[PDB]
Design a protein around this ligand. Structure first.
Ligand SMILES: Cc1cc2nc3c(=O)[nH]c(=O)nc-3n(C[C@H](O)[C@H](O)[C@H](O)COP(=O)(O)O)c2cc1C
Length: 242
């Protein structure tokens, strides 16, 4: 998948099988505010093309591609402009969580936008960081729509659990904590141990299937994806393009 057209066909094919799509525009690495605005135009194109596609409309983005480090204010201003367009079309925008020095700014942006009244925006939290439980607790008043991941970056042992056993343990802790608090939670993991435990837990707790989902990368464990959709789970696959 390279182009938007190829990505939207991929979404079509998933939908035939009861699985949903998350569209993720990757661009060249944004080096300047002008590049952040060019990336923004690619996002506005994405929103436009998803508009009145009949199925659920979800995009994922990286805030560094809107110039987060160059200027948080500008990244916020450009994201706001995107959400003003996306909200009225029913397009949900997930803010992908990047590496640890960018976490505080990411949460400030999310909080700011929520406080302005946008509601079809979510966050990602990563179980490998020490800081994540407090971030989750701090965010409960906002009622976040939350995607839970383990974490994709090499991080130092002062900020992240060094042990994979601890990373996995924190994932289940945070997941259950979020669900017990009433948040919609997307579980973005391939780990069959964690998936089995979460299916067990939601059943035992009587958490309806409409309150959580599973997320997989496009093409990874595709049988499992179809199996979960057949059992009535909300399942999404993440489709990068660009
Ligand atoms: C659908 C989806 C979305 C993701 N979004 C993020 C993100 O925003 N930030 C991040 O660090 N990792 C993200 N990840 C990566 C996870 O951190 C993890 O590295 C990867 O899926 C492998 O771990 P797992 O299958 O054992 O849970 C995502 C993974 C999936 C499947």
């Amino acid at each position: 998948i390279e182009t938007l057209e190829e990505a939207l066909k991929a979404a079509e094919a998933l939908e035939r099988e009861g699985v949903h799509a998350i569209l993720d525009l990757l661009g060249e690495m944004v080096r300047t505010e002008e590049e952040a605005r060019a990336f923004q135009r690619g996002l506005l194109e994405l929103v436009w093309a998803l508009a009145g596609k009949p199925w659920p409309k979800y995009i994922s983005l990286k805030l560094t591609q809107l110039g987060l480090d160059l200027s948080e204010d500008l990244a916020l201003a450009l994201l706001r402009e995107v959400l003003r367009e996306a909200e009225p079309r029913g397009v949900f925008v997930r803010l992908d969580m990047e590496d640890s020095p960018r976490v505080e700014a990411t949460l400030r942006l999310y909080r700011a936008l929520r406080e302005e009244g946008f509601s079809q925006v979510g966050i990602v939290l990563q179980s490998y960081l020490y800081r994540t439980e407090k971030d989750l607790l701090d965010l409960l008043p906002y009622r976040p729509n939350l995607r839970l991941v383990k974490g994709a970056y090499r991080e130092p042992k002062e900020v992240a659990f060094p042990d994979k056993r601890l990373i996995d343990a924190e994932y289940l802790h945070l997941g259950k904590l979020a669900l017990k608090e009433g948040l919609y939670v997307a579980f973005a993991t391939h780990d069959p141990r964690i998936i089995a435990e979460l299916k067990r837990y939601t059943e035992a707790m009587g958490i309806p299937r409409s309150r959580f989902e599973f997320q997989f990368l496009y093409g990874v464990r595709p049988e499992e994806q179809r199996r979960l959709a057949r059992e009535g789970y909300t399942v999404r696959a993440y489709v990068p393009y660009g």
